[PDB]
Amino acid sequence: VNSFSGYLKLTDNVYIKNADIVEEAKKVKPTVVVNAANVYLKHGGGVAGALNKATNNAMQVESDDYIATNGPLKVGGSCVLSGHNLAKHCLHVVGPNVNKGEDIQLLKSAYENFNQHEVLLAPLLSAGIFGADPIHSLRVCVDTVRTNVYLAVFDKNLYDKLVSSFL
Numbered sequence: 001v002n003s004f005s006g007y008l009k010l011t012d013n014v015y016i017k018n019a020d021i022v023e024e025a026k027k028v029k030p031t032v033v034v035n036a037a038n039v040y041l042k043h044g045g046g047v048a049g050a051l052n053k054a055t056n057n058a059m060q061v062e063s064d065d066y067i068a069t070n071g072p073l074k075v076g077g078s079c080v081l082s083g084h085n086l087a088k089h090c091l092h093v094v095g096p097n098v099n100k101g102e103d104i105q106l107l108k109s110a111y112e113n114f115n116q117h118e119v120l121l122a123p124l125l126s127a128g129i130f131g132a133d134p135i136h137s138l139r140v141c142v143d144t145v146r147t148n149v150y151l152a153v154f155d156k157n158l159y160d161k162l163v164s165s166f167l
């Protein structure tokens, strides 16, 4: 039993809800919140900009130190950093950004990072400003993640479409 509330169950291990991931994280304080990161951990917009803003820029400060030490992530890769006031940990995961020409096949590799964590609150990888089809992202999620994932979809119109079209 966990504290996530109001989710629709899609599969044995994947759950979905129309919710703002920032407000969901603040309420649940999950062990792991997933950020829709880029390789530079520059949290300017989309999910990342919103999560960072909610930490009062502490996520960005921590991220800049991480990059100064380690260099950029790989597309499809991840790192574990603090969750600040939102979660115990933040798993920064880099899905391919279609608006940069990156290979959509890397989306499966990106979701594989979720399997290192028993339970996660997460957005759909590569959706929103990363330019991929969210229906496809949900399909890859369900077919790749084996751990328990609670997906927050900000747009109510998109949420209804994802549910109604889910196979």
Ligand SMILES: O=C(c1n[nH]c2ncc(Br)cc12)N1CCCN(C2CC2)S1(=O)=O
Pocket (backbone or CB within 6 Å): 020, 021, 022, 023, 036, 045, 046, 047, 050, 051, 122, 123, 124, 125, 126, 127, 128, 129, 134, 152, 153, 154, 155, 158
């Ligand atoms: O939640 C957001 C989101 N995008 N910009 C934001 N700004 C502030 C806050 Br708070 C949340 C967001 N989505 C990111 C894109 C992928 N998803 C869409 C496809 C269904 S999403 O995972 O629903």
